[PDB]
Amino acid sequence: VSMTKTSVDCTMYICGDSTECSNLLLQYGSFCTQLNRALTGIAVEQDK
Amino acid sequence: KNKCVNFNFNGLTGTGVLTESNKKFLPFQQFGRDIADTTDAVRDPQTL
Numbered sequence: 001v002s003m004t005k006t007s008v009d010c011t012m013y014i015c016g017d018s019t020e021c022s023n024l025l026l027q028y029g030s031f032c033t034q035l036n037r038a039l040t041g042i043a044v045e046q047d048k
Numbered sequence: 049k050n051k052c053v054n055f056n057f058n059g060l061t062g063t064g065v066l067t068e069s070n071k072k073f074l075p076f077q078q079f080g081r082d083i084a085d086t087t088d089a090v091r092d093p094q095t096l
Binding site for chain 1: 061062063
């Protein structure tokens with residue numbers, strides 16, 4: 001019926017406790033925005 | 049102990065909580081890594 005609800009973040013996993021790592025991550029654009037938005041809808045999909 | 053601190057053991061930076069576990073530390077092991085490619089436990093060189 002359902003699966004395991006796990007939302008993998010692209011901020012802590014890519015940049016683990018770093019300040020200068022987040023400056024190069026935002027230069028790619030909304031790649032971390034569209035992945036966190038897509039994985040949020042999976043948690044609504046497993047509950048629906 | 050038991051607080052979200054900024055630990056620094058042997059040049060390894062990161063944000064975590066320094067807790068006490070039940071793992072018997074061997075006298076030659078300096079740091080042990082977990083399955084998530086991160087150091088799970090360290091050893092204080094001043095006092096074992």
